[PDB]
Structure 1
Amino acid sequence: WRYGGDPPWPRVSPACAGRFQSPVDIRPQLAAFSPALRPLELLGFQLPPLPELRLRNNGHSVQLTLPPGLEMALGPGREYRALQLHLHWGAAGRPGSEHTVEGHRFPAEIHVVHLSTAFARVDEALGRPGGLAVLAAFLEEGPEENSAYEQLLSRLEEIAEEGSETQVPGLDISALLPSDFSRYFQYEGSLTTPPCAQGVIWTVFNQTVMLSAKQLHTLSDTLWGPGDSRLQLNFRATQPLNGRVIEASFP
């Protein structure tokens, strides 16, 4: 499968034709304030330099495989383990976030994908309610260089080739996300690539993360995808809410 080209995604996986897909356009006017939504809690995200982590150009994104012991709770009793993180981006002067806010697309977006602690593997969790959870944050252009992101962005040149990988030092994974874990939107949707399984709990932070213009250019300009094409605009089209209500942890 590819972005913006065949083969249709429903031909690859029937679930990609589900009613309750991601990403979505977040309309904060239509979000339901839900004071049951408490601040997110992360454990084990401050990684030491060793062991190193695998960073891969899989031809659709750059993906960092996370080690065991990264624990995340959406609440009491809603516990998850982090599996991997990856990024979605655009191209020179063209935004490439997956989620939009009132139709506005942001320059890029980070997804941290987690498995519910009730499941031992991803394939048992696919399509099950709350089986997977994703933490998502928008990346915007800021004045300063983000030093947490520089650790990964400085390594993209090694993995320019489609299907290539490299080992990188452990880093503070939580420093790739916003500092405010109390303000977020939450809704139930899907994986945004095949197999597009539903039951995924998406949490989208209100606060954004700032990268420099150079950093954003490095992200969009360095990697190559399938065919002789640049790996760019690697975001799925907006999917309708279809009656789902997005919750907000703040009024």
Structure 2
Amino acid sequence: WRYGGDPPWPRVSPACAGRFQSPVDIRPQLAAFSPALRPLELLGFQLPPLPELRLRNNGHSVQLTLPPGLEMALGPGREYRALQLHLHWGAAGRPGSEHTVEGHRFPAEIHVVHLSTAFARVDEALGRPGGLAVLAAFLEEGPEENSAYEQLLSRLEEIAEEGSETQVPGLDISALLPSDFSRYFQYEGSLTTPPCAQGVIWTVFQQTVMLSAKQLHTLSDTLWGPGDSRLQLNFRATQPLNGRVIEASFP
């Protein structure tokens, strides 16, 4: 599989043809206020610098493999373990977030993928309701260099080639996310790459995180993918809600 071209996503995995896929267009006016959605709780995201983490250009994204001990809770009794995070981005004057708001596509998006504590392995979780949970935040231009993002983006040159990887010091993973964990949209959907398995709980933050123009250019302009193509516009087309109701932690 490779974005833009073919192989035919259903010909890879039949789940990429499901009715309840991600990403989606968030229309806040059609979102349902649910005061049961409490603030997200993160535990153990402030890493020491050793051991180092593996940052990889997998030719579809850049991903940071997270170590054991990062606990995330969607609520009381809704407990997850972080596995990894990766980015989606566009290109020179072209946004590349996966999710949209009222049709607005943002420059870029971070996904932090988690595994329900009820499951020891991803393959037991796939397609199971609540088995996987993803935290999604939009990346936008601000005036300052984001120092948490700088620790990853200053290493993209080392992993320009598809299939390249490098070691990076542990950092505050929570610092790649918005400070507001209270205000978010939540819906059920799928992985956004094969096998696009359903039952995924998506949490999209209202607050965005700020990168400098230079940071955003480094992300869009440094990596190569399948063949001699620039790794760019690495986002799936928006999928219809198909009668699903996005919830919001706020009216």
RMSD (Å), alpha carbons? 0.3
Q: Which whole-Å deviations, capped at 9, do the CAs of 1:134-155 have from their partners, x for residues lacking one?
A: 0000000111110110000000
Task: Give the whole-Å Cα distance in 2 for the aligned partners of 1:186 and 1:12.
Answer: 28
Q: Distance in 2 between matches of 1:183 and 1:218?
A: 29
Cα distance in 1 for residues equivalent to 2:214 and 2:93: 12
Give how far 1:93 is off.
Answer: 0.5
CA distance in 1, matches of 2:98, 2:129: 22
Please state whether the residue corresponding to 2:75 is helix, strand or coil: coil
**C-alpha distance after superposition, 1:27-67 (max 9, x if no partner):** 00000000000000000000010000000000000000000
CA distance in 2, matches of 1:25, 1:250: 18
Deviation at 1:6, TM superposition (A): 0.6
Aligned to 1:178: 178
Unaligned runs of 5+ in 1: none
Q: Percent identity?
A: 100
Please say if 1:6 is aligned against 2:21. Answer: no
1:54-86 deviation per Cα after TM superposition (whole angstroms, max 9, x unaligned): 000000000000000000000000000000000
Which whole-Å deviations, capped at 9, do the CAs of 1:191-212 have from their partners, x for residues lacking one?
A: 0000000000000000000000
Query: In structure 1, what is the Cα distance between the partners aligned to 2:37 and 2:227?
Result: 45
Secondary structure of the equivalent of 2:36? Answer: coil
Would you identify which runs of 4 or more consecutive aligned residues in structure 1 move more than 6 Å?
A: none
Say whether 1:70 aligns with 2:70.
yes
Q: How far 1:164 moved relative to its partner? A: 0.4
**SS at 2:149 equivalent:** helix
What secondary structure sits across from 1:74 in the alignment?
Answer: strand
Deviation at residue 22 of structure 1 after TM alignment:
0.1
TM-score by length of 2: 1.00
Separation in structure 2 between the aligned mates of residue 56 and residue 174 of structure 1, nearest angstrom: 20
**Structure 2: gaps (5+ residues):** none
| Count of aligned pairs | 251
Partner Cα separation in structure 2 for residue 206 and residue 21 of structure 1:
21
User: Aligned-pair distance for 1:12?
Assistant: 0.3
Q: SS at the partner of 2:123? A: helix
Q: Alpha-carbon deviations, 1:152-205, whole Å to 9, x = none?
A: 000000000000000000000000000000000000000000000000000000
The equivalent residue for 1:131 is: 131
Report how far residue 227 of structure 1 moved. 1.4
